Amino acid sequence: MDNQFIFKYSWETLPKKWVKKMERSEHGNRFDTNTDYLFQLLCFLKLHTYTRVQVLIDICGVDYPSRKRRFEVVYNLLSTRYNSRIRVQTSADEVTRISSVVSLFPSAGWWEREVWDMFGVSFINHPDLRRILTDYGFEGHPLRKDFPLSGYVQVRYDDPEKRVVSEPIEMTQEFRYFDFASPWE
């Protein structure tokens, strides 16, 4: 269906308290809702006849280290029947737990696990929530703006103990950051 038609219908049909912030543009229709109404909003968008969002594309995450709700998880959705694409995003925190959507879309389990791996945002009643991408025993969440690019620990082989061990990082050549940003912009 037409992008503006989704805009008008969804804004009129949806309960008013669910959507805190909403945006219409050519880039994509956006529904910024609260952290606790996310499950209900996703359930409504999944089952309603006119807005049949059946497949969840991915669960993203953006770190803004300048606001109280540092993280922002983004839910990209797709309506195969009506050929539309809606995007729902909420705000998170280092300690705030956000309800999972694995019950609706079973494919969201791995995306939620990787969001927890990268940003450290826990998900409520998520079955088997654990690190998926980083190695075993990893400390810190790499995709936060705080995490250094090179990390904190290295990996090498030590001969006294016949195994591969870990040390604090010792870079042979530091990452040269080139500051190309210029005024008049």
Partner: protein, 169 residues
């Protein structure tokens, strides 16, 4: 109810599934390629085809007079996505802007050609050589003398490659 119940067609199907007609037809195809000429090439004597745009060994060209083309503009170092190029420069007593240390870590290099297409003087190029295979790691840290030796060795062909594709881009 998928049905093929006809007196004539049951005989036709029950023979194909009994005398291995599909197997024989797929078997006789390989024998066709058994007698066909092969597509391989003996590598050490015959080399595979390449292109004038091939991305291989880094080389530091120089002017036909004998002065090196590199002017320490440091565009190659800034554009290099892998951050493999390190440059140090100072003004010689002649007053010319030249490099003293221009070393490329060929183990970080990704052979993308961004450095080659960023030079305003065509100082650095990627020659057609693809046969490094050094036995030591620190031999792969080219250090502005290996670059110039490569440029001298491949100049007669790098110049031809550059002049052939200069009409492009």
């Amino acid at each position: 109810k998928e049905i093929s119940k006809d007196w004539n067609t049951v005989f036709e199907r029950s023979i194909n599934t009994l005398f291995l007609t599909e197997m024989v037809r797929g078997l006789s195809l390989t024998l066709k390629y058994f007698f066909d000429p092969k597509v391989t090439i003996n590598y050490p004597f015959e080399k595979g085809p390449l292109s004038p745009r091939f991305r291989g060994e880094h080389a530091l060209r120089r002017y036909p007079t004998g002065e090196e083309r590199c002017i320490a503009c440091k565009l190659c170092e800034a554009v290099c996505p892998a951050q493999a190029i390190t440059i140090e420069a100072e003004e010689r007593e002649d007053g010319s802007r030249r490099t003293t240390r221009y070393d490329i870590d060929m183990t970080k290099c990704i052979y993308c050609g961004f450095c080659q297409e960023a030079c305003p003087v065509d100082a650095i190029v990627e020659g057609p050589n693809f046969e490094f295979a050094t036995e030591t790691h620190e031999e792969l840290l080219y250090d502005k003398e290996k670059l110039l030796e490569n440029g001298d060795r491949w100049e007669t062909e790098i110049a031809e490659n550059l002049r052939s594709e200069s009409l492009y881009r």
